[PDB]
Amino acid sequence: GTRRDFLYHATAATGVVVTGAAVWPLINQMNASADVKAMASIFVDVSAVEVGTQLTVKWRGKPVFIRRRDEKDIELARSVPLGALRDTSAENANKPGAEATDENRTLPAFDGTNTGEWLVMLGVCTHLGCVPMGDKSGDFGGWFCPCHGSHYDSAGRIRKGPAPRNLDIPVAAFVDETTIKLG
Amino acid sequence: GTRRDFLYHATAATGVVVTGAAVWPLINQMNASADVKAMASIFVDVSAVEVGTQLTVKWRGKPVFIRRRDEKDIELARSVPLGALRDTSAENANKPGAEATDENRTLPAFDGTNTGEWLVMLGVCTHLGCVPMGDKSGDFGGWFCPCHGSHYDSAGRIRKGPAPRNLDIPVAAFVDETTIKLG
Amino acid sequence: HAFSFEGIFGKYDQAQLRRGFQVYNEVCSACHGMKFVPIRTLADDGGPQLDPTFVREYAAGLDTIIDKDSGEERDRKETDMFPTRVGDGMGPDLSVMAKARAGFSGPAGSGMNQLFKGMGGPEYIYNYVIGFEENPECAPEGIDGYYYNKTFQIGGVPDTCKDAAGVKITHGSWARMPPPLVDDQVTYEDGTPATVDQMAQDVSAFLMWAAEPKLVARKQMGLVAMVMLGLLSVMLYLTNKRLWAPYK
Amino acid sequence: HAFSFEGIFGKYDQAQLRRGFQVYNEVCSACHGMKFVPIRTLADDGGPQLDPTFVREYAAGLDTIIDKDSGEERDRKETDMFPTRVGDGMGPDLSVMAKARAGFSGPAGSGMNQLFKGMGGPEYIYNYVIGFEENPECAPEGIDGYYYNKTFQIGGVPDTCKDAAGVKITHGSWARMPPPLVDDQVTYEDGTPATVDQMAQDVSAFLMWAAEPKLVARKQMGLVAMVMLGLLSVMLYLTNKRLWAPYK
Amino acid sequence: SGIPHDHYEPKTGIEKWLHDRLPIVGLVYDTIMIPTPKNLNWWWIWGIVLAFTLVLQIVTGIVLAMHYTPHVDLAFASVEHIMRDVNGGWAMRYIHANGASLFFLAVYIHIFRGLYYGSYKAPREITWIVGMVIYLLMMGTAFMGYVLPWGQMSFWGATVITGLFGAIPGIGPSIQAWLLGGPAVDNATLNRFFSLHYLLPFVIAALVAIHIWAFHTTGNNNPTGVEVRRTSKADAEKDTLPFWPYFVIKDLFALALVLLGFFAVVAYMPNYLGHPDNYVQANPLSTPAHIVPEWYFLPFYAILRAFAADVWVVILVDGLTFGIVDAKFFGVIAMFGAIAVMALAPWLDTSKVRSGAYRPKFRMWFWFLVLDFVVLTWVGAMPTEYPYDWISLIASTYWFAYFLVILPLLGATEKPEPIPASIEEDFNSHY
Amino acid sequence: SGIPHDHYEPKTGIEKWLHDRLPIVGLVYDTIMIPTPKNLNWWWIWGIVLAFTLVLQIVTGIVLAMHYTPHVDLAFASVEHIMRDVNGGWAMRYIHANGASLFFLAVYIHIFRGLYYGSYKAPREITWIVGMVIYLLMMGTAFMGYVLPWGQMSFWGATVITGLFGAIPGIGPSIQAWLLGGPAVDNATLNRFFSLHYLLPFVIAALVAIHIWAFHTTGNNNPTGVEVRRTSKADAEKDTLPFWPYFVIKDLFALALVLLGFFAVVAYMPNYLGHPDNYVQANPLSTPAHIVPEWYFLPFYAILRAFAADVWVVILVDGLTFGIVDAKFFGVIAMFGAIAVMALAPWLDTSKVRSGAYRPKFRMWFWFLVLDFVVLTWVGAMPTEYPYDWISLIASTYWFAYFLVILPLLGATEKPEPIPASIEEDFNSHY
Ligand code: HEC
Ligand code: HEC
Ligand code: HEM
Ligand code: HEM
Ligand code: HEM
Ligand code: HEM
Ligand SMILES: C/C=C(C)/C=C/C=C/[C@H](OC)[C@@H](C)[C@@H](OC)[C@@H](C)CCc1oc2c(O)c(OC)cc(OC)c2c(=O)c1C
Ligand code: FES
Ligand code: FES
């Protein structure tokens, strides 16, 4: 009734809440422990990188890309209709709400010029996270991730393949002409 | 067919020799792999060791003992009846067949003098392989292994406890007065 | 004057962890490492709780590291460890020493009638610092180095003032560590008289936190296992009272 | 031309491993490491087989090591690895490269029609050394550094002699590694004409041994699994012939 | 029902006392015997070979753990030390690596034996479904195995396959850093992947308990697809024989042959299946040029990359959801679900012909699926150009339709053949 | 013969179809039910608590493996990182460490409940013996677990306990370097001891299968020591109740109490049992001053160091063998064999009284062996001085004689007490 059937189902509630919030800390351990919980900015001495190549760099586990965009790769990156992009967001943290124009895939050099010459995105492809072959490879004078065949232009925007977004531009910022702070 | 009788029991012989010398390499892996398969001599700069203490030293996994025997510890080690020892072998590799007299628990200095002043045995106690507390501890003006309570004199010979032999003297040899080669 | 954590539901003293932090940095860090303590934890909850950007500045001042990738130096970051001060003249890494030391012998040497009290560890630290003495029994011009400590049982005893029989016929023994707090050696913020006792009361509680930094968490955890398994227990008793009473 | 191991029951050439060993020490060791090869193995069975006390003397001459305990240097021992030559101008650690390279199709990336033959690796090495060329069609200056190799698929190409479309109009690609064997660069013991081909045939079989040093063992093992599981099989066929024939 | 055979009467005095306290004598007698249908061909060996290959894996699996060190800085070197210095340690590594191919080669032959002869269909549905979760575990296990020696194949597949769970919308990013132990594929990942590659093959051995349990309980199937006379006891005797010593010995024989094969493969081509860039120590900055998944994941590999966002059915669904099932997550769902429609196989055969060689219309779609499979594994090696993007799209779709259209058709749209009524009758048909 | 209960008739349509393919419904029904004697007191809870503690260990055991790195240079630091940085990783470490005490505390109460009430003695012999190998395994497992965080207690116990096998003459030095992986206790030891501390608790769960199997087959024992009316079916109903929901719920309750206990121990004194020199990173040159074995190994510790070569019986045997069973090897044999005479317990009770509180002569020797045990664990903490060498020699000899002299005597030299004939009758002597 409830004198010989209420304090039966009540106990198996406590025999579920106790063996529940004991089975949650078994899950939580597998999250990021404090040895990797945070990791803040780094400084990159560009200063002596040559022109028209990329410099790959590890930060927070996975690579960052810095290509100093040569002449072909700014013409053919500006020659790109905004409406002929999948992801039409800038993928930029510096310029948050912006759209994926070739002027939104860029860093200013002294702290204000901005010429199309600084391309800094990070080496995680948006499909399943591999790295793209650089120096004009594949089919859009850009970047070919050979993992499941995504293709990128010369602003890291997405063209062919399964990768649903462009390459993210991080929170990059200059300090002087020798140096870039990733933060 | 005609070759048939013990063929039943013949196959279960092959179904035992095949699943035998397949169950032997399962054993052999657990032996010493080639990262530890051998080990060779080292040089010890005694020179600046002070008098009447011990210097402990790692060689081939486990410690070696070098005590420079002070006055008390050569009187009271010579004052020892050979037949009042358990192990009455010298426990020496240098002097193989010798018996455990206080002149057989020693080494040269000027490659030939031998005064009772050089005591070099190794820190593996003979019971179950722990290390002995030094500087006259326990009960025989010597060495007390606090693992199962063995007692040693002042020549590393065995007195009280369960340890069935004396501490072994290795293949020690001098080169000049500053230096001892353990080989 | 009896620690704050210790008890049945006491916590770390917010004040005293900070107070005792400064004593490590000024006095003990030249001879002792914390190679198992990540520096970032100063700013953590349930500890001394500092400013994050201070912690960064503090960490900058600790010495360089042959960094594992570049293979060359840099100013130390806050993600990194305190340095391994174990070279020469240097003492043990006290990285987790305040649970590595428990010279507590009895009753009947098995751990028995410690029934109002505890286990012993932070209070061996307190006694190690205070107990630096004049060499009592015999011994002339020191032992050069080896300073007499009245608590340190396990080190040098001379046989001149050991025995003829066997044992040491003194209590403590001779360390290897200079008497590290000549009194008022640093200056406090929350008033607090900087005594040799008050600095050694204080640096004890800090070095406990470099052993159990998650301590005030287990005090919190305990109360909740007390409710949960308590009234699962109480509820399971009621389910045997009014279910077995058919056959009782 | 055709290696000794390769085949169905061939072994390592005793001579050729020794011959090729010297080429690593004199030519390649300045720019390449073997950090996964313990030096003591030169004297091992089924390899080049040297004198143990020579091996010791040889090992003495390889450079120092910040040894893990003392924290300071010594002359390298025979228990230790070859050194990590990976600094600057330096190439890949070839420590286990002759199974890390297999630039072979099928038609499949993972493989097909290799039915009289093998897997490919020691023969990429041979072709890497021989194929240092003059620059085909155009690319008529170098690239400063980056030397044209006709075999090295995976590297730099001046797009001048890549394409207007996609790939390379000129055969291999531009390395980063200087043409390392200007012919007769060292001197042999068992006669043997020290040609650029004969030195590159020879150092190939040695770097296979730094990938499968236990190789002549699996050849030995194979013969015994062939007997054992062979006449357990044959014996199990006879136990089905004259046991199932009641119902057959 | 239960095929009736003479069970265990504890006869001698030994066994009379044993049986009062632990009846293991009889449990092994009543399972080593068992009225097992007598017409069974060599496509039925592939379950002993599987079970063997699980013991072999389990066994070599532990040797390796006595030597391999699961931490990034040590990991590839430890494995590499196992090759050089551990006595017989190369023959352990090669045997446990090539084992997983054998383990997987034969699980396929196991599955296509079962697909022909109605072995998914009643009474056999629980036998089938339990094999699914064994499958699932076997793949996820051999995944985590591959991550361990931290070579480039190891590393990037870990970045890929954990990223697959990121494809899940909303909750999916969280599931990522949960399996990852954070931001990237660092060490916390390799430490947790040592753990679970050890645990899971024991769960797998407990599920072959419940698989051996099931196929005993249904009664063992036979290739006529007819059941095994559970009416009298002596007509069962004409239908069946005991496992031991007839079907034990057959399964032993073919195993000794399968093993005669397998030993030659380790001894004379042990890195054929292995993709040599795993001997290239893992670089978190360069994904290799020729990153191929290991062979036994290749046909499902291809299902994932059939469906780019040019494939109209994707565009549609990205269209109809208006943003969510893009060709990332679509291809995930595609591939995961390419398996789910193979689980679904007893519910979507509608025909009450059990078997195979008395079903000639089904018989030719099937050898199109065998083909389909081989072509799907093949086209995984091929790039995403024309014709390969089409070829893959054909293979993927044939697959996906065979379980969905062709199967719950063919019941309606086909009549049988000369199907027998006795297991003996087929067996007697030759002489 | 076996207690007659109403078994499983697959009643509803669900279960009718399930049962044709996998009968698990009924196997769980016929084991969650079971005619379990109704007079069972709280000394019978300690087998559920044991089984729980094994699940608890197995569970927290794997968490820890996702984090702990088994290699000497990383090992103590990894464990140390688990305390600090793994979310809740201190509460895992403390719970898996203190678990093994609980796991061992209660296995003792389990063993002395069984020692009183004739639970070794027929029909119950195989129930007992399987518990022996579960014991051996649990000990060796908890050994290898303690080696892992490479502290000084870890290190030296591994030098000691491997060295125990070196005490074997002739072949014994080989068996040493086999478990060692060479000369000393280096790293090859800690890599192999990671492996087998993972494997062995699975073998342990597979033997609690064959333990639960056995005590069902004998029928569950009761404190009268009389068997449970296997003649009619309705007199068994007066004798027994079903496990579920009567004896499931009792074993739940006491567990929730045992766990209420165990959680307070972790939360407020978690290094009490742990001997603090394990937080002293392992030095291969200094064996510590106060090296005590872990508490649950302490009374057998003492049996090894009772027998120094002053102990006359040793001198005798060193005498009689003329050199071979010196007090090294003797004390090994003494300690290993101190267990072997507890395995031997059903053959050396001669009395055909099964139980206990109807046996008043036996009942007071027993509380001497409880005391003996407590004194033996105690005197392991004590040095080898007078009186402790005598005390330990008294304890060790009492022990050894209880199973050898006192037990196959007392059959002859003692008559019973008022023993009942019904399980109900004792139970009603209360209603
Ligand atoms: C260098 C001049 C030191 C100063 C400053 C501090 N310590 Fe130290 N300590 C030092 C040495 C060389 C040793 C060796 C061990 C011995 O034989 O005495 C120590 C020892 C300790 C110990 C305990 C070691 C033991 O064996 O129990 C402790 C707990 C300790 N030291 C603590 C400590 C504190 C709290 C300090 C700051 C006030 C401090 N030490 C300073 C060297 C030096
Ligand atoms: C310094 C002048 C070197 C000499 C001497 C040798 N190698 Fe080398 N090598 C060097 C560099 C900087 C590289 C970089 C990779 C590239 O972009 O070309 C290499 C490369 C190799 C490789 C393969 C690398 C790859 O990407 O496939 C191999 C197999 C190789 N080198 C072999 C090799 C041999 C056999 C040598 C002795 C005759 C030798 N190298 C010498 C630098 C230098
Ligand atoms: C990988 C571990 C496996 C083992 C160890 C194993 C073992 C066995 C054995 C001994 C049999 C009996 C006959 C035979 O050998 O063909 C069998 C049959 C069967 N298995 Fe598996 N098998 C495994 C995998 C699978 C998988 C992965 C599936 C499903 C996708 C599956 C589904 C079946 C079916 C449906 C049968 C036939 C039932 C019958 O003949 O009554 N099995 N297996
Ligand atoms: C279902 C059973 C198993 C499967 C399918 C399997 C699969 C694999 C695979 C594919 C690898 C990679 C081999 C390589 O690339 O070198 C591997 C490695 C490894 N597995 Fe297993 N395995 C199984 C059982 C086990 C078990 C039970 C263990 C538990 C100890 C284990 C421990 C290891 C270890 C230590 C390695 C590293 C050795 C190496 O990479 O060569 N395996 N496994
Ligand atoms: C450590 C794992 C063990 C588990 C998980 C376990 C579990 C159980 C359970 C559930 C029972 C039934 C009644 C009870 O709880 O008292 C039982 C009884 C028993 N156990 Fe164990 N037990 C274990 C250890 C042992 C050991 C170590 C021994 C022998 C030295 C042993 C010998 C027995 C005996 C003789 C019985 C009584 C049989 C009966 O009541 O018919 N058990 N155990
Ligand atoms: C019969 C079950 C078990 C027993 C008696 C047992 C016992 C122990 C003990 C006493 C320790 C030392 C704890 C310490 O000093 O910190 C330990 C450590 C450890 N055990 Fe187990 N354990 C069991 C189950 C398992 C299993 C199944 C695993 C398999 C993954 C495992 C993995 C570990 C690990 C990684 C450690 C090191 C963590 C640490 O030392 O704190 N345990 N175990
Ligand atoms: C933490 C991890 C856990 C809990 C396990 C997760 C398991 C997911 C699945 O397990 C059931 C998974 C194994 C299974 O998916 C159905 C496979 C067939 C995955 C197929 C697979 O393989 C690849 C591979 O091997 C690579 O190597 C060089 C590289 C790869 O990229 C290029 C892939 C890849 O793109 C895919 C889809
Ligand atoms: S992951 Fe970038 S291509 Fe598939
Ligand atoms: S080990 Fe030396 S006394 Fe037991």
Chain E residues 87-146 within an 8 A CB cutoff of chain A: none
Q: How far is the CA of C244 from the centre of ligand 4 (A)?
A: 52
Which positions ≥6 away from E252 have C-beta within 8 Å?
Answer: B15, D236, E48
DSSP code at position E163: H
CB A51 within 8 A of CB A70: yes
> Ligand 2: which of D32, D88, D96 to mutate, most ligand atoms within 8 Å of CB?
D32
Nearest 5°: the CA angle D156, D159, D165 is: 120
E197 Cβ inside 6 Å of ligand 4 = yes
Sign of the Cα pseudo-torsion (C59, C62, C68, C71, in order): positive
R_g (Cα) of chain E, nearest Å: 24
Separation CA A136–CA F25 (nearest Å): 64
Separation CA F363–CA F248 (nearest Å): 30
Give the bridge partners for A152, in sequence order. Answer: A143, A158
DSSP code at position A50: P
Q: How far is the CA of F179 from the centre of ligand 4 (A)?
A: 23
Give the bridge partners for E431, in sequence order. Answer: none
DSSP code at position D88: S
Q: B1-23: buried (b, 16+ CB within 10 Å) or exposed (e) per residue? A: eeeeeebeeebeebbeebeeeee
Q: What is the dihedral of CA D68, D73, D78, D82, to 10 degrees?
A: 80
Would you tell me how many other CB atoms lie within 10 Å of the CB of residue E366?
18
Interchain CB contact of C223 with A (< 8 Å): no
At residue C53, φ and ψ (nearest 5 deg) are: -80, -15
Q: How far is the CA of B151 from the centre of ligand 9 (A)?
A: 9
Would you tell me how many other CB atoms lie within 10 Å of the CB of residue F411?
14
CB A137 within 8 A of CB A117: no
Peptide bond before D178: cis, by omega within 30 degrees of 0?
no
Torsion-angle region of B132 (φ positive above 0: left; ψ -120 to 50: alpha; else: beta): beta
Whether residue B108 is found in the same domain as residue B20:
no
CB E53 within 8 A of CB F182: no
Interchain CB contact of A34 with F (< 8 Å): yes
User: Using a CB-CB distance cutoff of 8 angstroms, which residues of chain C are in contact with residue A7?
Assistant: 235, 238-239, 242
3-class DSSP state of F8? coil
CB D209 within 8 A of CB D98: no
Residues of A forming the active site:
148
Q: Does domain E1-427 have CATH number 3.90.1150.60?
A: no
3-class DSSP state of B34? coil
CB contact under 8 A, D99 and E257: no
Residue B137: what residue type? S
Give me F212's structure tokens. Answer: 């639960």
User: Using a CB-CB distance cutoff of 8 angstroms, which residues of chain E are in contact with residue F213?
Assistant: 22
Separation CA F239–CA E76 (nearest Å): 63
3-class DSSP state of B109? coil
Nearest 5°: the CA angle A175, E284, E188 is: 105
Separation CA C205–CA C122 (nearest Å): 7
Domain boundaries, chain F: 1-427
CB F4 within 8 A of CB F231: no
Separation CA C150–CA C173 (nearest Å): 6
Enumerate long-range contacts of C108-113, CB under 8 Å, 24 or more apart.
C108/F378, C108/F381, C108/F382, C109/F381, C109/F382, C110/F378, C110/F381, C110/F382, C111/F272, C111/F381
- Rounded alpha-carbon distances, angstroms, from residue E414 to E223, E226, E357: 20, 19, 14
DSSP E strands: which ranges in A115-171?
Answer: 118-122, 133-137, 142-145, 150-152
Distance of CA E367 to the CA centre of its chain: 19
Nearest 5°: the CA angle E64, E148, D35 is: 85
CB A42 within 8 A of CB A109: no
Q: Annotation-wise, does B147 bind a ligand?
A: no
**What is the 3-state composition of chain F as percent helix, strand, coil, each rounded to the nearest 5?**
65, 0, 35
Nearest to F291 by CA among B125, C158, C94: B125
DSSP F31-90: HHS-EEETT--GGGSTTHHHHHHHHHHHHHHHHHHTT---STTTHHHHHHHHHHTSTTHH
CB contact under 8 A, C232 and A14: yes
Give me F430's structure tokens. Answer: 């209360």
Give me F80's structure tokens. Answer: 């140390």
Separation CA F431–CA C6 (nearest Å): 50
DSSP E strands: which ranges in A75-124?
Answer: 118-122
Interchain CB contact of F327 with B (< 8 Å): yes
CB E83 within 8 A of CB B23: no
Separation CA F149–CA F83 (nearest Å): 12
CB E53 within 8 A of CB E99: yes
Residue with tokens 């000084």: F152
Domain boundaries, chain C: 1-213, 214-248
Give me A3's structure tokens. Answer: 């004198």
Distance of CA D128 to the CA centre of its chain: 11
CB contact under 8 A, D222 and E264: yes
| H or E, element range at A45 | strand A43-45
Whether residue B63 is found in the same domain as residue B124:
yes
Residue to mutate among B4, B33, B42, B59, with most D CBs inside 10 A, is: B4
CB B153 within 8 A of CB B134: no
Which positions ≥6 away from C39 have C-beta within 8 Å?
Answer: C55, C58, C59, C62, C76, C77, C78, C79, C80, C81, C82
Separation CA B74–CA B61 (nearest Å): 29
Which positions ≥6 away from E341 have C-beta within 8 Å?
Answer: E348, E400, E403, E404
Give me E381's structure tokens. Answer: 């090696």
Distance of CA E61 to the CA centre of its chain: 18
3-class DSSP state of E212? helix
Q: Whose CA is nearest to atom 1 of ligand 4?
A: E201
Separation CA A119–CA A78 (nearest Å): 13
Q: In sequence order, which ranges of F285-326 are alpha helices (DSSP H)?
A: 298-304, 312-321
| Resolved by | X-ray
Atom of ligand 6 nearest to the CA of F149: 40
Peptide bond before A96: cis, by omega within 30 degrees of 0?
no
Q: Annotation-wise, does A145 bind a ligand?
A: yes
User: Using a CB-CB distance cutoff of 8 angstroms, which residues of chain D are in contact with residue E252?
Assistant: 236
| H or E, element range at F179 | helix F172-180
- Burial grade of A5 (CB within 10 A; 0-12, 13-18, 19 or more): exposed
Q: Annotation-wise, does D28 bind a ligand?
A: yes
Separation CA E151–CA E142 (nearest Å): 15
DSSP code at position C174: E
Nearest to F212 by CA among F31, F59, F355, F343: F31
Which positions ≥6 away from F328 have C-beta within 8 Å?
Answer: B126, B127, B128, B162, B163, B164, F167
- Burial grade of D61 (CB within 10 A; 0-12, 13-18, 19 or more): exposed
| H or E, element range at B21 | helix B7-21
Residue F69: what residue type? T
The total number of structural domains in chain A stands at 2
3-class DSSP state of B65? strand
Give me E307's structure tokens. Answer: 């469906």
Separation CA B134–CA B141 (nearest Å): 9
Would you tell me how many other CB atoms lie within 10 Å of the CB of residue E32?
12
User: Using a CB-CB distance cutoff of 8 angstroms, which residues of chain C are in contact with residue F291?
Assistant: none
Residue A104: what residue type? N
DSSP E11-71: -SHHHHHHTTT-THHHHHHHHHS-EEETT--GGGSTTHHHHHHHHHHHHHHHHHHTT---S
Separation CA E329–CA E151 (nearest Å): 27
Bridging pattern class, strands C173-174 and C148-149: antiparallel
3-class DSSP state of C170? coil
Separation CA B99–CA B91 (nearest Å): 8
Separation CA E365–CA E61 (nearest Å): 39
CB E392 within 8 A of CB E379: yes
- Rounded alpha-carbon distances, angstroms, from residue D98 to A117, D104, D123, D206, E290: 41, 13, 9, 10, 17
Separation CA F131–CA F139 (nearest Å): 12
For A28, the closest of F66, F84, F88 (CB atoms) is: F88
Separation CA C55–CA C37 (nearest Å): 14
**Which strands, in side-by-side order, build the sheet including B54-59?**
B54-59, B62-68, B118-122
Give me C143's structure tokens. Answer: 């032992």
Peptide bond before F245: cis, by omega within 30 degrees of 0?
yes
Interchain CB contact of F1 with E (< 8 Å): yes
Resolution (A): 3.5
Give me A147's structure tokens. Answer: 């993992």
R_g (Cα) of chain C, nearest Å: 23
Q: Which domain holds residue A157?
A: 34-183
User: Using a CB-CB distance cutoff of 8 angstroms, which residues of chain B are in contact with residue C157?
Assistant: 135
Nearest to D5 by CA among D244, D240, D225, D214: D214
Sign of the Cα pseudo-torsion (B81, B86, B92, B97, in order): positive
DSSP F393-409: HHHHHHHHHIIIIIHHH
Count Cβ–Cβ pairs < 8 Å, chain B vs chain D.
33
Whether residue B29 is found in the same domain as residue B45:
no
Separation CA C216–CA F113 (nearest Å): 39
Separation CA A76–CA A55 (nearest Å): 21
3-class DSSP state of A130? coil
Residue B34: what residue type? A
Bridging pattern class, strands A62-68 and A54-59: antiparallel
At residue F366, φ and ψ (nearest 5 deg) are: -65, -50
Separation CA A49–CA A180 (nearest Å): 12
Q: At what angle do helices F388-401 and F327-343 cross, to 10 degrees?
A: 40
Give the bridge partners for D148, in sequence order. Answer: D174
Q: Whose CA is nearest to atom 23 of ligand 7?
A: E293
- Burial grade of E45 (CB within 10 A; 0-12, 13-18, 19 or more): buried
Distance of CA E96 to the CA centre of its chain: 17
Is the pair B, A in contact (3+ CB pairs within 8 Å)?
no
Would you tell me how many other CB atoms lie within 10 Å of the CB of residue E413?
10
Give me F362's structure tokens. Answer: 């036996």
Residue E265: what residue type? V
> Ligand 2: which of D31, D126, D130 to mutate, most ligand atoms within 8 Å of CB?
D31
DSSP F180-241: HTSSSSSHHHHHHHHHHHHHHHHHHHHHHHHHHHHHHHH----TT------SSSSSHHHHEE
Interchain CB contact of F252 with A (< 8 Å): yes
- Rounded alpha-carbon distances, angstroms, from residue A119 to A68, A128, A176, D244, E26: 6, 22, 17, 76, 75
Residue with tokens 């590297």: D155
The pocket around ligand 9, CB under 6 angstroms, is made up of B 125, 127-130, 145, 147-150, 161, 163
